[PDB]
Design a protein around this ligand. Structure first.
Ligand SMILES: Nc1ncnc2c1ncn2[C@@H]1O[C@H](CSCC[C@H](N)C(=O)O)[C@@H](O)[C@H]1O
Length: 273
């Protein structure tokens, strides 16, 4: 689990500054700040919060870093000790059942996580419960990644007529709609948030062929489970990663850098006073 997430955090860190800006955190009048990094992964939002809030003492604001994964939580637990984040606690938190206190947080952040929750309605209700009156929820969700297009190119050089999902189909297998501004906006209002703002932001970067291969590796079995039949899996499932190796090496080289543009929906809203 953790090795894959160390590859992924090189990318998700590019989306944290806009999340924090959209939240209004810098201008917030709520004090002291009491912040949750929900589904924190390796903690990239927490990294950015400690950079922004490094003009102030540790006692003047509080941070909880919560994730369902014990392995990812342990990584953040160690980062807290290493870097001296004395105001911060990392612990296992299920977004659908947080066990966190009612009316506690001034700000909840959930970066690139809501589509992973089997019951997003339970998670939205939990966030509304654990926010203070006047508290803020700010989230990001993927609209378009481009690692998938590299796997599609690999399947295309397997010499058989094989199905492969588009960006849209892959996004919509679990929790469709969070790639749409209007859907996300409506979800915030339906959950009880006010002063909802939604926007869409792209980042342009480069990813190594080695990193693209590691991103794709755990998702290949899911892809062929959902979109291939058993005959197709029997004959060709083990051909995908070799084809991806070949595609990446021949197109970009063993240490090539693959241009990337990924786009996310950002949304924020406020609990009533
Ligand atoms: N029910 C749940 N409750 C809390 N975290 C969950 C969850 N289901 C999945 N997750 C976590 O959601 C994360 C999505 S990856 C996003 C991680 C991080 N916020 C970043 O921007 O890089 C993973 O760390 C995964 O373990």
């Amino acid at each position: 689990i953790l090795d894959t997430y160390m590859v992924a955090e090189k990318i998700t860190r590019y989306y944290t500054q806009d999340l924090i800006q959209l939240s209004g955190l810098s201008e917030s009048s709520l004090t002291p700040l009491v912040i949750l990094d929900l589904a924190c992964g390796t903690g990239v939002v927490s990294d950015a919060l400690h950079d922004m809030l490094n003009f102030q003492p540790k006692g003047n604001w509080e941070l909880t870093c919560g994730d369902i994964s014990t392995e990812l939580t342990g990584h953040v637990k160690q980062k807290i000790l290493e870097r001296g984040w004395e105001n911060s606690i990392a612990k296992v938190v299920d977004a659908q059942n947080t066990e966190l206190p009612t009316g506690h947080y001034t700000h909840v952040f959930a970066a690139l996580a809501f589509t992973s929750f089997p019951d997003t309605y339970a998670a939205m209700k939990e966030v509304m419960r654990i926010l203070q009156p006047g508290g803020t929820l700010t989230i990001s969700t993927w609209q378009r990644t481009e690692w998938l297009a590299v796997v599609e190119a690999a399947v295309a050089i397997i010499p058989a007529d094989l199905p492969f999902p588009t960006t849209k189909e892959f996004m919509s297998c679990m929790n469709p709609g969070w790639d749409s501004e209007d859907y996300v906006h409506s979800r915030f209002e339906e959950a009880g948030f006010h002063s909802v703002q939604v926007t869409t932001i792209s980042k342009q970067f480069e990813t190594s062929v080695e990193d693209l291969y590691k991103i794709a590796q755990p998702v290949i079995p899911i892809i062929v489970s959902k979109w291939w039949n058993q005959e197709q899996r029997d004959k060709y499932e083990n051909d995908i990663l070799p084809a991806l190796q070949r595609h990446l090496n021949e197109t970009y080289g063993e240490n090539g850098l693959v241009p990337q543009e990924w786009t996310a929906v950002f949304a924020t809203g406020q609990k009533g006073s």
